[PDB]
Design a protein around this ligand. Structure first.
Ligand SMILES: Cc1cc2nc3c(=O)[nH]c(=O)nc-3n(C[C@H](O)[C@H](O)[C@H](O)COP(=O)(O)OP(=O)(O)OC[C@H]3O[C@@H](n4cnc5c(N)ncnc54)[C@H](O)[C@@H]3O)c2cc1C
Length: 447
C-alpha cells in the first residue's frame, strides 16, 4: 500500500506518524515543497523575543529522523497536480526542474494556508512583511535590531498581529496596531477582557487604532506611511497579519471546494474524490459548541484531523469527535485562554447565550500571593449547558480551560460545574475554585 502525504507541517506530519503505527508495512512518501521540514511557526514569538536563539531548532521533526524510520522524504519537491481517477500526482523537483508522475493507493493532503496580503496602492514597497514560516521569521528578527526601524505598524489585531506587536514593542520600537474591528483579540475574548489588555498594551507603547480601513501604503521605494480612511501613520516596517487564504487554487476543478476556497470534507476527512483525504487549515472542522462546521485554523485541529484521516484510510469507521476551538496566549503579564462560544462567535452563528463574569482574587485573603483573575462562563439560556469560557490573570491559571473544553463536549450544565469536585489547597486556589465560583453565580442568576 503506497500512501503519499503532502505537507510537512502539523497535518501532514501527524498523518505520517499514525501511518507508521497503524500501517508499518506501507511505502510512505512525504512531500514538502519548501526547504525545511516541520518548522513550527508556533515558536516564532519565542524566537523574535530572544528566548530561542537558533531558528533552526524551532521544529518538531527532521527528514533524516523520518528516513531512519523508513519514510521516503522529498523536500524541495512540490505536488503540482492530482489526477484522482487514475490515482496519480505530478510532482516537480524544484532544485532540478524535473517533473514526474507518481502513483498512489491513498493520498492525504494538508496544503495549508498562505498569508492574506492587502491589495492596495503601494502593495509592496520594501519593508511590508508577512508572518508565517522560517524565512519570514529570519527577516522579522533582523528588523528587531535594525536602528533604522523606529515605527512599526502591524495591520490585524488577532493572535498573530498581537504577537508581532509585543515582539517589536519589547525590542524597543514604537508600534501601532490598525484594524477595521473595534477591539483587539475580539475573536478570542470579550470586551471586559480586551479592555484590560488594551490598557496593558498602551502602557507598553503600542497604539491601537481600531475601526480604520487601510487605503494605501506611501513611500519612496520602501514604505514610509500607512494611510487609512481616518489617519496617516509613519511606518518604517509594516507587518501584515490580517488573516490567511487556503492554499487551494491549484485544486480548483480537481476537488470540490467551498466558495471561500476551503476543501469540502466529511467527518472521516474524505474529499469529493476516492482515496484522497484532506486535513488542516484548508478545511472546516466539526465545532461542538454549536454543532456546525467552522474553519478554525489551529495546530491542535490539524494534528487530530491528520490522525483521523489515517484511521479512515480503508473504511469510514471513525467519525471525527469535534473540537471546541480552545486557544491561549500570554500578552505581556497576562495569560489568557478561551474555548467555545464568545460574543463574536455567537453573533456570527446567530446563537443566543447568557454569561456571568467573576473578577476576584483566586487565592484566599490571608495568602499574600493572591492575585485577581477574570473568568466568564457562557451558557445556553434554555438548557443551561456550558457553551464557552474565558479566563485571564497574571498568574497562570490557563490549564483550567481544559476542564471547560471537556464540559462542553460532555454537555454538562452550570449546576454540574457549580458542584464539580475540584481540589482545594490554599497555595493553589479557594475552597470553591475559579470554575465553581462562576458556575455558582450562574446558578444564582437562574434561580
Ligand atoms: C505565527 C503563527 C503562530 C501560530 N501559533 C499557533 C499556536 O501557538 N497554537 C496553535 O494551535 N496554532 C498556531 N498557529 C496555527 C498553526 O500553525 C496552523 O494551524 C497549522 O500550521 C496548520 O497546519 P497545516 O498542515 O494545515 O498547514 P501549513 O502549516 O500551512 O503547512 C502546509 C505545508 O505543506 C506545504 N505545501 C503546500 N502545498 C504544497 C505542495 N503542493 N506540495 C508540497 N508541499 C506543499 C507547505 O510548504 C507547508 O509546509 C500559528 C500560526 C502562525 C502563522
Amino acid at each position: 500500500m503506497k500512501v503519499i502525504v503532502l505537507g510537512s507541517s502539523h497535518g501532514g506530519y501527524e498523518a505520517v506518524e499514525e501511518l507508521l503505527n497503524l500501517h508499518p508495512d506501507a511505502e510512505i512518501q512525504w512531500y514538502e515543497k519548501g526547504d525545511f521540514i516541520s518548522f513550527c511557526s508556533c515558536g516564532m514569538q519565542l524566537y523574535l523575543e530572544g528566548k530561542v536563539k537558533d531558528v533552526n531548532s524551532v521544529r518538531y521533526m527532521t527528514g533524516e529522523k523520518m528516513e531512519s524510520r523508513g519514510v521516503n522524504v522529498f523536500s524541495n519537491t512540490e505536488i503540482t497536480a492530482i489526477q484522482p481517477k487514475e490515482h496519480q500526482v505530478t510532482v516537480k523537483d524544484l532544485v532540478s526542474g524535473e517533473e514526474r508522475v507518481e502513483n498512489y493507493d491513498k493520498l492525504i493532503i494538508s496544503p495549508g494556508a498562505v498569508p492574506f496580503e492587502l491589495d492596495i496602492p503601494g502593495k509592496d514597497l520594501d519593508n511590508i512583511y508577512l508572518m508565517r514560516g522560517r524565512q519570514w521569521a529570519i527577516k522579522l528578527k533582523q528588523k528587531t535590531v535594525d536602528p533604522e526601524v523606529n515605527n512599526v505598524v502591524v495591520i490585524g489585531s488577532g493572535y498573530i498581529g498581537i504577537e508581532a506587536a509585543e515582539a517589536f514593542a519589547k525590542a524597543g520600537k514604537k508600534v501601532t496596531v490598525i484594524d477595521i474591528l473595534d477591539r483587539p483579540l475580539g475573536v478570542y475574548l470579550d470586551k471586559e477582557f480586551t479592555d484590560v489588555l488594551t490598557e496593558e498594551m498602551e502602557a507598553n507603547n503600542i497604539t491601537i487604532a481600531t475601526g480604520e480601513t487601510v487605503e494605501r501604503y506611501e513611500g519612496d521605494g520602501r514604505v514610509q506611511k500607512v494611510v487609512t480612511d481616518k489617519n496617516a501613520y509613519d511606518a518604517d516596517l509594516v507587518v501584515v497579519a490580517v488573516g490567511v487564504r487556503p492554499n487551494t487554487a491549484w485544486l480548483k476543478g480537481t476537488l470540490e471546494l467551498h466558495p471561500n476556497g476551503l476543501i469540502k470534507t466529511d467527518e472521516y476527512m474524505r474529499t469529493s474524490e476516492p482515496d484522497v483525504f484532506a486535513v488542516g487549515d484548508a478545511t472546516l472542522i466539526k465545532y461542538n459548541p454549536a454543532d456546525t462546521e467552522v474553519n478554525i485554523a489551529l495546530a491542535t485541529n490539524a494534528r487530530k484531523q491528520g490522525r483521523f484521516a489515517v484511521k479512515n484510510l480503508e473504511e469510514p469507521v471513525k467519525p471525527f469527535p469535534g473540537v471546541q476551538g480552545s486557544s491561549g496566549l500570554a500578552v505581556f503579564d497576562y495569560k489568557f485562554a478561551s474555548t467555545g462560544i464568545n460574543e463574536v462567535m455567537a453573533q456570527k452563528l446567530g446563537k443566543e447565550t447568557k454569561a456571568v463574569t467573576v473578577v476576584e482574587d483566586y487565592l484566599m485573603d490571608f495568602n499574600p500571593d493572591k492575585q485577581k483573575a477574570w473568568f466568564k462562563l457562557v451558557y445556553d439560556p434554555e438548557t443551561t449547558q456550558i457553551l464557552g469560557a474565558q479566563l485571564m490573570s497574571k498568574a497562570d491559571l490557563t490549564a483550567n480551560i481544559n476542564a471547560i473544553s471537556l464540559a462542553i463536549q460532555a454537555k454538562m450544565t452550570i449546576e454540574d460545574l457549580a458542584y464539580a469536585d475540584f481540589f482545594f489547597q490554599p497555595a493553589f486556589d479557594k475552597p470553591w475554585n475559579i470554575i465553581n465560583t462562576a458556575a455558582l453565580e450562574a446558578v444564582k442568576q437562574e434561580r
